[PDB]
Write a protein that binds this ligand. Structure first.
Ligand SMILES: CCCCCCCCCCCCCCC
Ligand SMILES: CCCCCCCCCCCCCCC
Ligand SMILES: Fc1nc(Cl)c2nc[nH]c2n1
Ligand SMILES: Fc1nc(Cl)c2nc[nH]c2n1
Lengths: 346, 346
């Protein structure tokens, strides 16, 4: 059924740019939308100026969006729950404040949409997997795709995929998240692993994109990094048991090419400074997702015996003061090779 | 063998930007490089100013690159032949001036590299297929990948794929085209059809990218157009008997994302003006490859019963004065769907 679903209430845990942007999306499909933010003082401010001046300045929030520091009131009555809490705080949130939330979600069978991205350092697990330790899979879906927050928040045409092991679960969330004016369109897929992998790895690759630019390279190089980088996402996805159908879709190449072409992003800028010879210490003044993700990514890759040429070199440049130019030469020391892509048709 | 091959002579038929750029690449692997250009008066000019002021202004040609209007002297002694002659002139060139050239190529078993891109209107065939009517396949390879001419001509890091039904043929051309400083790296593949399809369709899609921009959309939209557009390249490739291994590689998504992000390209500008409501007649002052390719592409698609949503709508906007906004709505009238990508791993 391509018929949309409207709800009475939606709750979004995570007040970042993406989370706020998604709250704007939901304000067009849900009579009420609550956005949980821990700092009460800042919550009042946001509700007063009707604008998330903290992480989405310049965008006026719909009048039916209300920020709150009260976890209980936040999810109370919600018919869909979105998690956009940073990876490092995810587990702690559930242990310290998710008790009743979890019970409610299970009791009322409320759909949960995972929008958090990254890799937990202690377990090398992805967001949806972490959340899966507290909530059952039947209620878990992941949202991923080329979706700059500003564009999503202001209703500029955007496409994303919704992933769930059970495609029917994804299709229902697809009916909830897709907007009436077709400005936010969702596509269903089963590849939850591919989505989480791509969402994490793209940030590391984006730093490599920055490096290439700071190294004097142009757009041909960026296109090659994206194409060869996507294969690393594919290989890691396979090793993690993912079906891989999201790799060459919106969450995979779609989001990857977008993220690697965002020259003003912190991942890019950090990479550019690294390509220009600046030491990481000096650059650190700004925590780019790519920097934080590179270590656990490398450890997970090693643990699974997955070779990730680009990501490995990016880790060396960022963590082992490796000279960008030398890293590049090492990458190319492999010699002439075949593109390494299987045929699609026999 | 990852060991490079150097030659005494190389000839490039086609003096355009890409052809000249490739001549620069060859000047680093071939003692002598001839570039055929029909107009003798212009040939003398280029050789005097040692610069292709006609299609690659600003780039000084290597001293071992010589332009010429003499087809015979051009290929005489060449150990590799590149064709970059525009599609519409390809067949006529072989009929009127390729007689001895063809004989020589067959006699000496000289490798031929097809760099021309497009669709011949009269036969709806691709460049390598057209050339295949005069020369045997064993000697035919195709070059495709994200490769802006200026960057290639000046040695800025670039990656491309070399396609040949017989992978061993591609691997040898890969040893010839790849440069000693690893600034131009070639990857071998068998998907000649996918490469030719992607190279032609990308220009039509680039116009759609322009439309999206002139329509007020942002980068999320562009990323979605690239991802969904790639599927049209895939489907058409399948229908033409291609193995498809190039679709998600350098010649496919690599070149596509690059071509769709070139905001200053004619395909983009034409698309932008169309998205802004300007009639094609008014815009035409500049023949964008996308405009010329859209008609034969649509006719070939219809002939093979291949649905190409984006390319079809772009054809309507360009040839049938269809309102960009209406085209967009028609594209989205399909309703909620699954992403439609098969799993890569079982
Ligand atoms: C980290 C610097 C940016 C690199 C520029 C892109 C180069 C892409 C080529 C990758 C080839 C990898 C060889 C496979 C082992
Ligand atoms: C031609 C205008 C540009 C369109 C902007 C990109 C939209 C991509 C969505 C395509 C969906 C196609 C539905 C499949 C039939
Ligand atoms: F952001 C953010 N979110 C949550 Cl949930 C937190 N818990 C402790 N610090 C935290 N910071
Ligand atoms: F460009 C270009 N190339 C060739 Cl080969 C031609 N033959 C006739 N006009 C032509 N224009």
């Amino acid at each position: 059924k391509d018929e949309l679903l409207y709800l009475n209430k939606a709750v979004v845990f995570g007040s970042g740019a993406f989370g706020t942007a998604l709250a704007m999306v939901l304000s067009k499909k849900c009579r009420e939308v609550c956005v949980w933010h821990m700092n009460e003082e800042e919550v009042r401010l946001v509700n007063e100026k009707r604008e998330n001046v903290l992480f989405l300045k310049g965008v006026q929030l719909a009048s039916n969006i209300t920020f709150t520091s009260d976890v209980e009131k936040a999810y109370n009555g919600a018919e869909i729950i979105l998690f956009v809490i940073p990876t490092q705080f995810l587990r702690g949130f559930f242990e310290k404040s998710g008790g009743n939330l979890i019970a409610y979600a299970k009791e009322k069978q409320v759909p949960v949409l995972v929008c958090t991205k990254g890799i937990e350092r202690s377990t090398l697990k992805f967001p949806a997997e972490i959340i899966g330790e507290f909530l059952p899979s039947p209620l878990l879906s992941v949202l991923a795709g080329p979706s700059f927050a500003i564009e999503v928040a202001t209703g500029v045409f955007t496409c994303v995929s919704i992933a769930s092991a059970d495609i029917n679960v994804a299709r229902r969330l697809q009916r909830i998240m897709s907007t009436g004016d077709r400005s936010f369109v969702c596509w269903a897929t089963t590849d939850t692993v591919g989505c989480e992998v791509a969402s994490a790895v793209k940030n590391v690759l984006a730093i490599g994109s920055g490096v290439a630019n700071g190294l004097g390279m142009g757009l041909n190089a960026r296109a090659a990094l994206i194409m060869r980088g996507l294969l690393e996402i594919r290989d890691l996805t396979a090793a993690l048991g993912g079906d891989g159908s999201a790799v060459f879709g919106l969450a995979g190449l779609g989001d990857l090419q977008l993220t690697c072409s965002s020259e003003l992003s912190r991942n890019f800028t950090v990479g550019k400074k690294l390509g220009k010879g600046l030491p990481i210490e000096e650059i650190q003044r700004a925590v780019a997702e790519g920097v934080a993700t590179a270590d656990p990514l490398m450890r997970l890759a090693k643990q699974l015996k997955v070779k990730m040429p680009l990501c490995h070199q990016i880790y060396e440049i960022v963590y082992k003061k490796k000279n960008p130019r030398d890293a590049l030469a090492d990458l190319l020391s492999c010699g002439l090779q075949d593109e390494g892509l299987p045929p699609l048709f026999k």
